[PDB]
Amino acid sequence: PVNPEKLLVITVATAETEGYLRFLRSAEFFNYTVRTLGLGEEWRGGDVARTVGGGQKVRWLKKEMEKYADREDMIIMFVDSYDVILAGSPTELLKKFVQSGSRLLFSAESFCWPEWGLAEQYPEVGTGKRFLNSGGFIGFATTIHQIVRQWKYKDDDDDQLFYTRLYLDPGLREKLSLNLDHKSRIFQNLNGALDEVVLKFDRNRVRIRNVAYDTLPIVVHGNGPTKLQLNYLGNYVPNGWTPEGGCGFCNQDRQPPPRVFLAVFVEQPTPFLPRFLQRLLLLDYPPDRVTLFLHNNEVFHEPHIADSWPQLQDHFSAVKLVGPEEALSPGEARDMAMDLCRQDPECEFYFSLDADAVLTNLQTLRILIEENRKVIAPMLSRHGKLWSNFWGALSPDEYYARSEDYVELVQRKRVGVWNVPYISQAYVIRGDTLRMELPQRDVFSGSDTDPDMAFCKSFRDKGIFLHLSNQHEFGRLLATSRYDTEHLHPDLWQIFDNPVDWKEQYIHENYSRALEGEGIVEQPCPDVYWFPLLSEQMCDELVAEMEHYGQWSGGRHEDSRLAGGYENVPTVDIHMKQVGYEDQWLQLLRTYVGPMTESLFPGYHTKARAVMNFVVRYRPDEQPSLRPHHDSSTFTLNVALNHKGLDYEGGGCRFLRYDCVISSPRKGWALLHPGRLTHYHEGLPTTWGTRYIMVSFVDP
Amino acid sequence: PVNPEKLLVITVATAETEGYLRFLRSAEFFNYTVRTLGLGEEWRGGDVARTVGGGQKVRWLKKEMEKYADREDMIIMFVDSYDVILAGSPTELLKKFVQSGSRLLFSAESFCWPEWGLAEQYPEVGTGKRFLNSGGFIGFATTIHQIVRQWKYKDDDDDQLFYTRLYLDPGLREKLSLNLDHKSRIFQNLNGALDEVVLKFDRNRVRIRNVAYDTLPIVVHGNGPTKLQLNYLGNYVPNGWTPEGGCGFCNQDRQPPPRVFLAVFVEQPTPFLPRFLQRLLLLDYPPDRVTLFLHNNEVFHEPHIADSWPQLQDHFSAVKLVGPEEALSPGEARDMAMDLCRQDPECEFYFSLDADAVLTNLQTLRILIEENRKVIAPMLSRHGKLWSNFWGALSPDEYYARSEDYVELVQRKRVGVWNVPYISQAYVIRGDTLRMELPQRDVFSGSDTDPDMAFCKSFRDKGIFLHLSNQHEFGRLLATSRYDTEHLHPDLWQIFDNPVDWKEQYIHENYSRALEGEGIVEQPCPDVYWFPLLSEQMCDELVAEMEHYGQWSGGRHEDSRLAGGYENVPTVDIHMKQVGYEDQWLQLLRTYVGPMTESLFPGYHTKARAVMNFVVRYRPDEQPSLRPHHDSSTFTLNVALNHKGLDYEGGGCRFLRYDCVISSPRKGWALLHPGRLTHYHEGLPTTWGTRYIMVSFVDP
């Protein structure tokens, strides 16, 4: 048994990037002892992500190996740091190195890089990996010193080509006992073997398994175009996320705060924008520390922004609006907003937030700042769907692709802070990162690609982690696909696409509590029920939408009412079918009226069928009342739409068979009474002003 | 001005028949002085109604004229008595006789009788009647004596031929100044001038007018085949019936009573016969003075007669039944019943009463006896139609014909006791008339004609008046046209043909009082109404008609009920459509349920549409209860059909939304509740016996 204290891990890292700090955490988890070479110098190895290079690593290693040139007692493993995570203990590592019977064991991959012509000089291996990879090797300190001493080349010369030619020496291969980890018992290179690697979970740690050779490797190396696939594995291995302990680096359980530059973007006609602008005042963060930027590209929202701006300017420390007259594209506006924080040393954090993002958690800004990340984003999903503000993986064309754990994250099966290749809609960026690591202005613009895809690619090219947190419920995304903007109040027609937001704005706030009972629903007349249904904003926008139509009912209008022996009981009304709002009102009946009816009438079941839906107008100048009659319906929904006293003086409904009078109608409330036989109801006269009501004859 | 005291009316009458007593009343009305010849002797004039004769009249007249042979001061008018009524005063009579300038004025007719060949010897008249009629003449006593003295012929020789030949003497016509009343200024002969005579009404008397000559005759003579047409006029002229004083001889305003022979005839399957037999016990007349005869020709009524016979035999003085086994035709049975009174000197009055006659007036037998007629009949009309138990006139074939005043009598515009040519169904005949005037037994039988037509013709041939009284409301006639006798209770199907009798037998006795309000209808549950609808006999015969069908509902029977979200709420029931009683029950809903619904639910209007009508059976052995559900109807009719306690132990209906229970159903009563939404009703379990209910789902 080789003593673990005789093991030394040597790596090269010119800066403490996120990939390096991720490597060190996996090393400190297994109690490895790591010596890092080159933390202060600059990288002279060229552009190793693009072409050949990395000779500066061997030069620093040769200088380091001169102290251990005669140390036969020391085992030394050299691995990369930016794209390597450790999945195994030193004891298992040394045990597997002894079983190999090699004095210097290199890693093996599927490609002969960089010179493909040397593929013949390699020995024939049956089913394992054939060629050498310099990204990770382990061996005796003396045998390594006899190899790394021969390096006398430029800093920008390929390091793997140097180790390959020394391995391809048949004599030197036999003398020093050089071998390649063919079946990935210690080193796992991902390039060319992506389908071979899967995760293997345990109670409090995670490893990887090579299903092609049935091995549990120790070193996971994301060489080449597999850096994203390693970020996926790095979210778990070794203790990134565990089934019993949860994630390992997130905050989980949670005097001036940092100054923030909030940047709102309205790049398309967005529903419920006045609700979004009113929510900016409610974010739980000291507003005197927030500087607001807002870019509105739509002229449809200029009145919305103007109504909210006096409150925004008085709330935040500073505000600035860039309206549609500047003719700014989405890429140019996001560059400008981000650069305003970059060029200000007082901007400690940058918070971009699109208009279609609804922040239900008012502490979102704090939560993301406490996570202490460079780029972190809150998880926002479309209500009841898998669509969300992040991607789990990329296609070969760097477009969308579903990751193996994408659904587990959206459904919040596994919770934590995840390294993901794409974020959007909302994210918090550290101010230092914008000045030190992405100082250029062309972050979103520059190339013919989506400004949002270029923003994420600009951070991946610099080795920045795009974090995504689903540790808490942050909010949801709106549906802006087909937003019909040609209405006096287009948010009324948003009951299908955004029902959760439609309910908060239009349905009465006490409706849901009334549906659960507890003494809200009243019974003013024997079989007439009274419950709150619509909000004051719903009543106002519906009345205004009717008057904006203008063409009310006059002579020769027939409503399905019953008086005496004829159906000649008219009203001055407008049907929902005339304004193109029939399907939208039927959906209100199915979702909110139907369930309320079956609760108040035990045994009755509705599908909320209704062919007669209309708004009645009562005025002393034209039809101020309605003579007694029956309704052609099983039950009738009678909803007021304005105030008694402020808008009209006059009675409401009167049921003759009971001598019961509804003399004081409530604005947002609704009446639910049977239409036939027992409820001969009469409309009391309106003496002053105008009285509006919404009425549907349900289940005829 | 000739003194009226010098006028003498001489007539011939061998017996005080009804036609003679009618003549004397018209004569005593105008204060005429009449001398009647031959009241004691027998008629030797032959058969004047068939052929020629009447010479015995001239012989008695010649003997009478010998005292007034020299009386120039005396005017004398000779007329018949059986077929003559006086319409004018003596003053008007003498005045018109003076204006004629004749010493002996004969009556004129349209036919030369008996010898038609003598029509040429008559003088030419332009437009009036040409030939002589011996039925009535007026002249001086001396001139008449010089004519009647020449009579020296047999008693059976024609009298008109004698007066005609004396008139056809041109010399004697000029000497004695003989003339004919051509234009009917005094004498009106009806034969050959029927269309010329109409009635002329006044305040307190009636006359006749000859519209062909515009005259008001004094003597109305029904010569030849016009005796019935005179009976019509005799009902008014002169004071028979007046528009201001009503009829003149009827009783109008009303110690042992006479003994009566009551004869009931059942010659066809008649509805409501048990009701008729129970009514015979209720006739207001001392039953110890009534002898009952009953002829039943239908075996269908043998059980009906047998059930009532113990009560009939114990009620009347004597009873006798002649059932269907005797094989008696209707003519033979009516001859036998009438002859049983004829051959009994203790039978003072004979009362025939058919089965289809419903006597609503319990004092009918008294009323007709107080009228003191030979043959009188109470007026009975089909309900709401003109069909009744009498004819107003006859056709030339002695079949039915409508008289001029037939509709005024049926509708009781004119009321009184009327001389009509035909009666049926019910009539009272004096016992003396059967012994003295119609002693033969073949009254109804004998000739190939209807036994009812031969009965009336047998009385007209003897000069008997067939009286008909509509002075009071006596009753009605049943409809026995198409009586479907193939049912366990055929009177259930009699709601269309005899609705007034159907209502008294089957509809609850307190239904009509409840329909007028006044605290009979109850409201046990908020919108559930409780009123009496059916009688105990209706419930019993309907249940028995269901069990007589036998095929109740078991598995896979679906009634239009609503529970949860399916219509799978069955019952053990039988629909009215299965027993051929759907149309009959729909008529009950329209006539009796509908009006009750519109009274209890002000504003609702029904036509009593119902596709689901059925009788439910609840038993502990099969389906003792019914789980909560709704009904596919606007309102539901729930009628009990038996007694709680005597037939079943178990609850009734339960409405869950009100916690109201109908624990004690009433047999003939009905429940009226809405079917949808508010009345989730549940059928309580039947613990013992059997529970029947009738239920209709009205207005679906």
Ligand SMILES: *[C@@H]1O[C@H](CO)[C@@H](O[C@@H]2O[C@H](CO)[C@@H](O)[C@H](O)[C@H]2NC(C)=O)[C@H](O)[C@H]1NC(C)=O
């Ligand atoms: C919904 O219900 C709540 C409580 O039932 C209402 O809150 C009350 O509102 C009245 C008038 O605005 C106040 O006088 C009370 O003090 C409130 N109660 C509480 C506990 O705050 C609320 O107004 C209802 N919503 C609407 C739209 O009427």
Ligand SMILES: *[C@@H]1O[C@H](CO)[C@@H](O[C@@H]2O[C@H](CO)[C@@H](O)[C@H](O)[C@H]2NC(C)=O)[C@H](O)[C@H]1NC(C)=O
């Ligand atoms: C119809 O109503 C009358 C009166 O409302 C009922 O007559 C009463 O009947 C009860 C029980 O039979 C007697 O105790 C009372 O004395 C009766 N009242 C009178 C004034 O006679 C009659 O019973 C009802 N008919 C039915 C079929 O129930």
Ligand SMILES: O=c1ccn([C@@H]2O[C@H](COP(=O)(O)OP(=O)(O)O)[C@@H](O)[C@H]2O)c(=O)[nH]1
């Ligand atoms: O600017 C640099 C670039 C490279 N490296 C080190 O050189 C190694 C080679 O980089 P890379 O993993 O991208 O090469 P590959 O494994 O893809 O061949 C990295 O792991 C780093 O440890 C460094 O320290 N600074």
Ligand SMILES: O=c1ccn([C@@H]2O[C@H](COP(=O)(O)OP(=O)(O)O)[C@@H](O)[C@H]2O)c(=O)[nH]1
């Ligand atoms: O049995 C008789 C038949 C005849 N007459 C009298 O004779 C008259 C002639 O009868 P009738 O009127 O029927 O003859 P017609 O007028 O039809 O020629 C009657 O009016 C009676 O007054 C009579 O007294 N007894």
Ligand SMILES: *[C@@H]1O[C@H](CO)[C@@H](O)[C@H](O)[C@H]1NC(C)=O
């Ligand atoms: C690492 O070493 C520490 C001693 O400082 C020890 O407490 C811990 O259990 C070790 N962990 C592993 C995984 O060896």
Ligand SMILES: *[C@@H]1O[C@H](CO)[C@@H](O)[C@H](O)[C@H]1NC(C)=O
């Ligand atoms: C008939 O004579 C009586 C006298 O007894 C007289 O009272 C009556 O008015 C007279 N009637 C007529 C109609 O002449």
Ligand SMILES: O=C(O)CCC(=O)C(=O)O
């Ligand atoms: O004004 C009212 O409440 C009665 C109007 C009504 O119910 C109807 O529209 O039929």
Ligand SMILES: O=C(O)CCC(=O)C(=O)O
């Ligand atoms: O027994 C009852 O009264 C309930 C039965 C009923 O209402 C039905 O037939 O649906």
Ligand SMILES: [Fe+2]
């Ligand atoms: Fe309308």
Ligand SMILES: [Fe+2]
């Ligand atoms: Fe209404």
Ligand SMILES: [Fe+2]
């Ligand atoms: Fe049924």
Ligand SMILES: [Fe+2]
């Ligand atoms: Fe029912």
Ligand SMILES: [Hg+2]
């Ligand atoms: Hg190579």
Ligand SMILES: [Hg+2]
């Ligand atoms: Hg993006």
Ligand SMILES: [Hg+2]
């Ligand atoms: Hg109202």
Ligand SMILES: [Hg+2]
């Ligand atoms: Hg003649």
